[PDB]
RNA sequence: GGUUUAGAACGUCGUGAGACAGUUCGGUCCCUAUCUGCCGUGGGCGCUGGAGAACUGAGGGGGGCUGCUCCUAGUACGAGA
């Protein structure tokens, strides 16, 4: 029946300011509002193939409905940022849009392939202008044009990409002394933040010991889910660099339809648990038409995400 | 071609001949350049013995126009556009 298990489902939005990189990263994704899916097994053929539902958005203030009418259909948000500008007024807009629907955000600081590109500065820019509290998942290696890869704060390796074929044949590297000290600094500032998921993690670290990356990734995913933090990654979609690890972070922190509480509905008016519903293949059918389109071919075409239920080709439905 | 000749007509003016910054159709435009000027082109003598050539260069003239496309570069600027 179901081709991919619900747990292997990511509903991600790519929203940012204008020309921040959205469509470029989406093309790099298709290689490695416009809704489109993909099957990204993993970076090392790990993570048996996930089905990532990507809703590429506009970033213009003119088309703000075209992103707000997808935000409350999405389950996660991949907020893109440029590395020379970072937070723009347009970035503040879609940010407030996502805060209105309480989306668990990660961030992707694109355009590290430009002059004046920074990563620390843009992280702090996010922390000061918007209000978010970001945990840097990556850290750039190569300032503006020397940008070759990043260091992780979980694997402690360098994913320096191979620039012979576009961005697919990356290598794992020895995280050399180019930056191998700030790496430690922010790795520790990441552990200290993932400790912020349970008292039993305070007692875990406060023993003077660094816990394991498995239960650090689980803890940080819990934090993204409760919207407690935001995980920022670092890439360059135009120089075919950094995109696959942002996809990894999407797999590892963004929510599946079951990694959240149920969707609360209404039976006939506001009741106690009127029609709270959970994403399941056995529920009564329920969806939400988040977008109407005008088919060039037909003139009518309705987008919808099924929250609870399973509909069929021909099934009657109720415009509740 | 127009404008202002001699023909003819219209409207109007006048009794009329005729007339009208009124109109209309028709209606002959000559000169072999002496001088200056200019464009070329030579003859004489001169430049101090005659000749053949190669130059220097005072000075004079000619020439000086610009579009579009691509690159720098979707770079600077610009929240964006
Ligand atoms: N230098 C550089 N240019 C990029 C990068 N990513 C995208 N671009 C350029 O941005 C231009 C338009 O961006 P676009 O994909 O439309 O993003 P949008 O503003 O969200 O629509 C393209 O011609 C790309 O070359 C990058 O990482 N570095």
Helix A243-253 with A22-31: angle, nearest 10 deg? 90
The answer to whether the beta carbons of residues A73 and A286 sit under 8 Å apart is no
* Distance, CA of A63 to CA of A314 (rounded, Å): 33
Which residues precede a break in chain A, with C-to-N distance above 2.5 Å?
32
* Distance, CA of A96 to CA of A48 (rounded, Å): 34
* Distance, CA of A85 to CA of A107 (rounded, Å): 14
Ligand 1 atom nearest residue A59's Cα: 20
* Distance, CA of A41 to CA of A44 (rounded, Å): 8
Q: What is the DSSP string of chain A?
A: --SS-GGGEEEEEEE-SSSSSHHHHHHHHHH--EEEEEEE--SSS-S--EEEEEEE----SSSSHHHHHHHTT-SEEEEEEBTTTBS-HHHHHHHHHHHHTT--EEEEE--TTSTT--SHHHHHHIIIII---EEESEEEESSSSS--EEEESSS--B----SSSSSSS---B---TTSSSHHHHHHHHHHHHHTTT-HHHHHHHTTT----SHHHHHHHHHHHHTTS-EEEEE-BTTTTBSHHHHHHHHHHHSPPTTSSPPBP--SSS--SSSS-B---TTSPPB----EEE--TTTS-EEE---SBS---TT------
CA A158 to chain centre: 21
* Distance, CA of A191 to CA of A212 (rounded, Å): 10
Q: What is the DSSP string of A146-187?
A: S--EEEESSS--B----SSSSSSS---B---TTSSSHHHHHH
* Distance, CA of A266 to CA of A316 (rounded, Å): 20
* Distance, CA of A203 to CA of A50 (rounded, Å): 34
Q: Which residues are bridge partners to A201 per DSSP?
A: none
The answer to whether the beta carbons of residues A80 and A14 sit under 8 Å apart is yes
* Distance, CA of A246 to CA of A249 (rounded, Å): 5
Q: Which residues lie near nucleic chain B, judged by CB under 7 A?
A: A 17-19, 60-61, 85, 88-90
The CA-CA-CA angle for residues A9, A256, A23, to 5°, reads 65
The approach used to solve this structure was: cryo-EM
For residue A170, the CA-to-ligand 1 centroid distance in Å is: 22
* Distance, CA of A250 to CA of A107 (rounded, Å): 10
Please indicate whether residue A24, judged by its CB atom, sits closer than 6 Å to ligand 1: yes
Q: Which residues are bridge partners to A302 per DSSP?
A: A292
- Tell me phi and psi for residue A200, to 5 degrees: -70, -5
Instruction: Classify residue A253 as left (phi > 0), alpha (psi -120 to 50) or beta.
Output: alpha
Please indicate whether residue A90, judged by its CB atom, sits closer than 6 Å to ligand 1: no
């Amino acid at each position: 029946a179901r081709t991919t298990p619900i747990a292997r489902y990511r509903n991600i939005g790519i929203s940012a300011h204008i020309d921040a990189g959205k469509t470029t990263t989406t093309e790099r994704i298709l290689f490695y509002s416009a809704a489109t899916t993909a099957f990204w097994s993993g970076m090392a053929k790990q993570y048996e193939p996930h089905r990532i539902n990507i809703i590429d958005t506009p970033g213009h203030v003119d088309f703000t409905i075209e992103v707000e009418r997808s935000m409350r259909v999405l389950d996660g948000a991949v907020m893109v940022y440029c590395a020379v500008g970072g937070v723009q007024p347009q970035s503040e807009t879609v940010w407030r849009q996502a805060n209105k629907y309480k989306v668990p955000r990660i961030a992707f600081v694109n355009k590290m392939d430009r002059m004046g590109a920074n990563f620390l500065k843009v992280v702090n820019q996010i922390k000061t202008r918007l209000g978010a509290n970001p945990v840097p998942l990556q850290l750039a290696i190569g300032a503006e044009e020397h940008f070759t890869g990043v260091v992780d704060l979980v694997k402690m390796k360098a994913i320096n990409w191979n620039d012979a074929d576009q961005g697919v044949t990356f290598e794992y590297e020895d995280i050399p002394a180019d930056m191998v000290e700030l790496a430690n600094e922010w790795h520790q500032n990441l552990i200290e933040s993932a400790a912020e998921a349970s008292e039993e993690l305070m007692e875990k670290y406060l023993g003077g010991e660094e816990l394991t990356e498995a239960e650090i990734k689980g803890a940080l995913r819990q934090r993204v889910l409760n919207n407690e933090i935001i995980l920022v990654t670092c890439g360059s979609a135009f120089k075919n660099k950094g995109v696959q690890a942002m996809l990894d972070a999407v797999i590892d922190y963004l929510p599946s339809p079951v990694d959240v509480p149920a969707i609360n509905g209404i039976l006939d008016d506001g009741k106690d648990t009127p029609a709270e519903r959970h994403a399941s293949d056995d529920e009564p059918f329920s969806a939400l038409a988040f977008k109407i389109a005008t088919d060039p071919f037909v003139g009518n075409l309705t987008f919808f995400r099924v929250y609870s239920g399973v509909v069929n080709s021909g099934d009657t439905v109720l415009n509740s």
